[PDB]
From a paper:
Protein nanocages attracted intense attention as drug delivery systems due to their high biocompatibility, high solubility, and ease of surface modification.
The AP-1-encapsulated horse spleen apo-ferritin (AFt) was prepared following the alkaline pH procedure previously reported for cisplatin-encapsulated AFt. Briefly, the protein cage is disassembled at basic pH and then reassembled in the presence of a large amount of the metallodrug (a protein subunit to AP-1 molar ratio of 1:50 was used). AP-1-encapsulated AFt was then crystallized and X-ray diffraction data on these crystals were collected at 1.50 Å at high resolution at ESRF synchrotron in Grenoble, France. The overall structure of AP-1-encapsulated AFt, reported in Figure 4A, is very similar to that of the metal-free protein. Upon reaction with the protein, an AP-1 fragment that has lost the chloride ligand binds the side chain of His49 retaining the Pt-As bond. The AP-1 fragment forms hydrogen bonds with the side chain of Glu53 and with solvent molecules. One of the OH groups bound to As interacts with the side chain of Arg52 and with a water molecule. Since more than one molecule of AP-1 per AFt chain is present, analysis of the protein structure points out that there are a lot of free AP-1 molecules trapped within the bulk.
Residue numbers in the entry:
A (entry chain A), B (entry chain A), C (entry chain A), D (entry chain A): 1 to 172
């Protein structure tokens, strides 16, 4: 094992590889969400932009995890990336619900890795997750909750008009 | 025939003259659409601007075809320009449907000329159409499809209010 | 099928989805190559940068194909992404050989799609591939051939020293 | 004891004094390494600069620990500083191996203090170490591992030439 590796368990090394797979799967789900909203029969440019930006954020998350794996002397192992759960994502409301479920799953994977690091007494891992992931995930989930509330308030009223207004006046 | 003319069939020369007529007819249709939306009893400035800009694009298309006709040593022949199909264009939805039908007809005329150029082994014509027309037409048809979807989503909800919002928040 | 779709075969639509999968698989292979070269026991920063930049290029290729799919009124369909062919990539020479084999496979997939577009008389597809893919692929394969020649000239001489010099004086 | 001291154990206070001694000992070792590489019969300016910069980093580490000791109301106690382990440091490879062993020892002292802070429920200490020391130490050890790999690849090939090239083309 590495000349540099110190206090870095095989359990954390494997969990980090699994977390990379989860973040790349999430990036791929957001790519599908973004292009769905660019369809000529869906055509919500602000929604497409919101999800394409999240695809980039999740890929950057995966890349940060891979850099950290190499800095600790672990070995990156890539697995197949499962396709997204849907081919078509319904309304803006349906899509934002699917996104908040996906973010909560990433959050729970972060909290599980944090607990593993704590059990393995790995403060560099705990610091890394706290610094680069946990606060960003909480902020993103809160933003998605705010969006869900605003979408629901609008499409209860008058569904097509409310989806247009949310895209025009909240998203860009 | 020209001192410059080389590999330029009489079939392509005639089809180019017909395509100029189609583009000028389209420019004239967009002029009528634009001024309809400027009527005091229609009054959708963003819609008028959208169609007036397309009138200019179609005239520029015709002018590019005429320049190319002279560059190849063909002879421009102008015919009567038929008036537009309607005097009044209904709602924004009606108008955008009429526009996408007109763009699909220009697209099919481009594809027909491309096929003629291919049959006549005229790669300069094929390159000209690919470079200046085919991609612009696909992009425009996609934009009109996106508009149709957004208009339909809005005027299903509440017709007059939805037409106002589309003009204010999408068009300018 | 789409309000916008015109002259866009189901055969091309499916081949475009397959080509997106190939480009995303290639992006993933380049991500693995890049992080392999960042390992503390490999440590060739210029090589890691070369492959990470190609990971971004291949993802941008996939995104361009998806935009084009929507512009033509086709429907993006995502499949599972197969993991890369290796977990460890050997020397710079081994890696550059694996990269040129992967680029030739993408090139052959582009040429196959071009031939399908030609058989289906789809000049917009032929133009799209010629404009955004075919010349970039030829230029990249030539650059990789130049690299392979320089690496082979260096590591024939004195393997570790030659790999260091190539990374320091050609790559960045 | 201090008017300001709160939740700051005598065990942590003593361990912080010991850690200051370790960091100043490391600074002194890097001073000796730097001046060894400036000898007219060694003469590797980039290597001398690398170690002199680390001498400054380790002294800054000690100074940060002393500031923190006073901020918590502990009392700085200075002990004799042991001379470095060698008077002459051999090749660049020998020196970089000695440096990575010294950094791993500082890292293990940081992890031991983190574990003590955790046992004493001292989150300010845990935060201080995570913020200013743990990530810097991991990044430095990874950089030294990368250097060791590159030096070994070069001096396996042709020892004197490889040491020159590493100094000229990696270090400055
Ligand atoms: Cl372990
Ligand atoms: Cl002829
Ligand atoms: Cl078909
Ligand atoms: Cl105490
Ligand atoms: Na370890
Ligand atoms: Na769980
Ligand atoms: Na937002
Ligand atoms: Na001719
Ligand atoms: Na026809
Ligand atoms: Na527009
Ligand atoms: Na079609
Ligand atoms: Na083939
Ligand atoms: Na290059
Ligand atoms: Na205390
Ligand atoms: Na210990
Ligand atoms: Na350095």
């Amino acid at each position: 094992s590495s000349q540099i590796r110190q206090n870095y368990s095989t359990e954390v090394e494997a969990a980090v590889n699994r977390l990379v797979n989860l973040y790349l799967r999430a990036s791929y789900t957001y790519l599908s969400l973004g292009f769905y909203f660019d369809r000529d029969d869906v055509a919500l440019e602000g929604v497409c932009h919101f999800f394409r930006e999240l695809a980039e954020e999740k890929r950057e998350g995966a890349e940060r995890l891979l850099k950290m794996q190499n800095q600790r002397g672990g070995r990156a192992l890539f697995q197949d990336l499962q396709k997204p759960s849907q081919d078509e994502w319904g309304t803006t409301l349906d899509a934002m619900k699917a996104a908040i479920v996906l973010e909560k799953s990433l959050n729970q994977a972060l909290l599980d890795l944090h607990a593993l690091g704590s059990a393995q007494a790995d403060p560099h891992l705990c610091d890394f997750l706290e610094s680069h992931f946990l606060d960003e995930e909480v902020k993103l989930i809160k933003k998605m909750g705010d969006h869900l509330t605003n979408i629901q308030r609008l499409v209860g009223s008058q569904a097509g008009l409310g989806e247009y207004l949310f895209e025009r006046l909240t998203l860009k």
